[PDB]
Amino acid sequence: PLSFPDCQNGPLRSHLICDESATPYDRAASLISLFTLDELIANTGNTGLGVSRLGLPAYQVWSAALHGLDRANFSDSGSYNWATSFPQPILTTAALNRTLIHQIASIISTQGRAFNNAGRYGLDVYAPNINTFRHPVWGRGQETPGEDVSLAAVYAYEYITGIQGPDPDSNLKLAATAKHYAGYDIENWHNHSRLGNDMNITQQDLSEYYTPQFHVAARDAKVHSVMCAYNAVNGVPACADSYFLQTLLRDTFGFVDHGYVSSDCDAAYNIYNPHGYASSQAAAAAEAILAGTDIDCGTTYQWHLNESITAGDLSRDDIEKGVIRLYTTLVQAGYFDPYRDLTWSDVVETDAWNISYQAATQGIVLLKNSNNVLPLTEKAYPPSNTTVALIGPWANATTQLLGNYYGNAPYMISPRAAFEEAGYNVNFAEGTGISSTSTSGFAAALSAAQSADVIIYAGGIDNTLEAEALDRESIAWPGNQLDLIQKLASSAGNKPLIVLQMGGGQVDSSSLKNNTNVSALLWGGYPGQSGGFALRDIITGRKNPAGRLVTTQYPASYAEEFPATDMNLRPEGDNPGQTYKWYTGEAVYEFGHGLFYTTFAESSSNTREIKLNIQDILSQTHEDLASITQLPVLNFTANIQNTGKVESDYTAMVFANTSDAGPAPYPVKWLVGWDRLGDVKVGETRELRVPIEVGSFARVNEDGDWVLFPGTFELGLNLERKVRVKVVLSGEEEVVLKWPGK
Ligand SMILES: *[C@@H]1O[C@H](CO)[C@@H](O[C@@H]2O[C@H](CO)[C@@H](O[C@@H]3O[C@H](CO[C@H]4O[C@H](CO)[C@@H](O)[C@H](O)[C@@H]4O)[C@@H](O)[C@H](O[C@H]4O[C@H](CO)[C@@H](O)[C@H](O)[C@@H]4O[C@H]4O[C@H](CO)[C@@H](O)[C@H](O)[C@@H]4O)[C@@H]3O)[C@H](O)[C@H]2NC(C)=O)[C@H](O)[C@H]1NC(C)=O
Ligand SMILES: *[C@@H]1O[C@H](CO)[C@@H](O[C@@H]2O[C@H](CO)[C@@H](O)[C@H](O)[C@H]2NC(C)=O)[C@H](O)[C@H]1NC(C)=O
Ligand SMILES: *[C@@H]1O[C@H](CO)[C@@H](O)[C@H](O)[C@H]1NC(C)=O
Ligand SMILES: *[C@@H]1O[C@H](CO)[C@@H](O)[C@H](O)[C@H]1NC(C)=O
Ligand SMILES: *[C@@H]1O[C@H](CO)[C@@H](O)[C@H](O)[C@H]1NC(C)=O
Ligand SMILES: *[C@@H]1O[C@H](CO)[C@@H](O)[C@H](O)[C@H]1NC(C)=O
């Protein structure tokens, strides 16, 4: 029942809500001033009932857009029957291509507007997830930009801008919602449910790792909405945490005027049960509202704010504040007044660009290529003369391609189907399942391998192990897949054995790493609707891999070394440090790892130290930048040459480390920039230019303050660290973010 109010011939035509010359806030305020208390409360939840006597339509706040129109009112046939399903964010982020994220978000927003013009979708979306994949067992890590907060911040900016449009204040395409704020990275590990979890986070970790990306989403991307998490932090449920919502988000992080906060579905209720922070549903609703949660996902507000009023927990003005914020966003989206002409044909066109396929091809990571077995070129292995064995619980994957939540897709291309369409003769055998103990399927799998010229095993994990409400307990390969893989390796007989490790989280593949008969190892995440074509084309060399890992592949014992609910990044107790930045152990495959189908030579651009003064750089002008921390202080440059026989895109991560600047402990390293050079021809020498903002050089004190310290920094290209630059910062320490108090 989604429609638009009639501001020309409807009951509101005479009121300021329908005066396109007024300010958006004043329009929404007058509209709310036309309500009764019952009508007002009826619109405090995600399923807002509207006001019938005023011609005000019902509005649904909950729309899913994480990686496409993941849930909409689809038709059974014809128009509005499907929508593009892109890879899960974890795979897209591994392509290290900011413009890719922006374009995906813009396409999603176009199709969303098209469905909303047809009444089948909302005007605000509960995306993007910009939490980090801190601990490898998290069942929603597939929905995140990885474990590094800088990548999460850039993803937030590109996605939120693509979703909202170029003019978010005046002609908003769709309102985005940064989630989940904050400290939400665990579902149920060892019965530590997100609904009741009370996570202990130091102010230092809060400032340095858990909040920064939400600061970017607010100040730089001007996100219109933020969603507060189910969990509590240092004893306070996120949606009842006046410190998170007012002090930080609204007062420090630059949340747009009249931006609205939504609770998770239903975090407001969890304030009462199971957190126990409130003694009743009415008290929970009042506390959430007073802390700043404007709109409830659920029915706690709509069914219990009368009790809140009756108990003197708040006033009607308190309730009006949140509804006014929500409808201010709606007014800025043209609700009561360009994007309104988008229609089904625009969905068809944008899907037909196949940006989903491109995202998969760009994001897939090559972890192992022994003796250049890959690519299996169409010349060396012609389709008409080649049989490929497609084995594994991912070989026939269609819905598995789309990840935890997805809507109607135009099509789902399994690896098997893709190799068949290409004209290969394919022997398919499941072999085993994701988490099975049976061997009944091994014989058929081995038989398919015996008759084949190449063996492709597609397996790993999927949503039967990692999902919302479902955390992993082990990070080893599950089931008996490794056993079957080893049997395949033993019987291969110099036939290429390509292993496809799928899923959002990583699995300990050290076994495959040291196994000589295992020719190649690729990570495919959740590659979206065209995953089969992307995987096939990477294997054949029709596309060349350049993705890198945005998550660390830990040894299995990592998941037993310390409690996953430990929020401390820096090593302490049995925690060896978490994330590439602080991890003191030996990873199986490191964050930032990735191979290419060609060799690239990395040379210094000027065959050299960079000395800079804190006060000089921090007193400069910063036109077009909201903060001086965004100012480029140098360009990290190197020469990249294609010394191989195939043209390939090239990706680079720039890492920084220090041993003197600021307080100990000192990080192993941290990501300061990244780039992707497209289509580097054979022999070409392209130059790498990565700006390094002064923020990258700041470090966080225990009070949570961001400070630029004097000392020596080292900047290194990728994991090989061949090209290097020394940066000496002189002067006095200066605070660039003054962490507020409670
Ligand atoms: C980082 O990531 C970005 C992606 O955001 C990437 O830039 C993109 O590169 C791709 C590859 O060239 C571009 O894809 C093509 O886009 C056109 C339309 O683009 C127009 O509109 C956009 C959005 O407004 C503009 O930005 C852009 O400049 C153009 O004006 C599509 O029409 C293309 O589709 C055809 O090719 C696909 C394969 O590439 C096919 O799958 C598809 O079916 C289409 O086939 C065509 O030919 C067929 C016959 O061969 C025919 O049957 C079909 O009917 C059809 O005519 C294609 O999707 C994309 O636009 C770029 N986006 C931007 C924003 O620039 C960067 O390259 C990347 N950086 C790296 C990797 O280093
Ligand atoms: C590029 O986009 C087109 C858009 O249709 C894809 O072509 C469709 O693929 C499905 C699955 O194979 C077919 O059932 C449709 O009939 C195809 N339509 C047309 C018009 O050809 C194509 O697969 C995409 N290329 C990729 C994903 O690599
Ligand atoms: C889906 O949208 C159509 C067209 O707007 C409408 O007729 C139908 O009732 C909707 N179904 C829902 C919202 O369940
Ligand atoms: C409060 O409102 C809810 C939802 O409309 C209703 O179910 C409940 O009976 C109301 N309580 C009182 C005391 O009116
Ligand atoms: C492979 O996938 C297709 C499409 O979902 C399905 O019809 C078929 O039963 C699957 N085969 C096996 C062996 O699971
Ligand atoms: C980085 O390179 C651009 C383009 O060459 C240049 O304009 C900019 O000043 C450089 N950044 C520096 C010098 O900090």
TrEMBL record:
Keyword annotations from UniProtKB, A to Z: Carbohydrate metabolism, Glycoprotein, Glycosidase, Hydrolase, Polysaccharide degradation, Secreted, Signal, Xylan degradation
Single GO BP term: xylan catabolic process
Name recorded for this polypeptide: xylan 1,4-beta-xylosidase
Family recorded in the similarity comment: Belongs to the glycosyl hydrolase 3 family.
Glycosylation sites: N73, N306, N396, N635, N657
Catalytic activity: Hydrolysis of (1->4)-beta-D-xylans, to remove successive D-xylose residues from the non-reducing termini
GO CC terms in record: extracellular region
Chief site of localization: secreted
Subcellular location(s) per record: Secreted
Pathway linked to the protein: Glycan degradation; xylan degradation
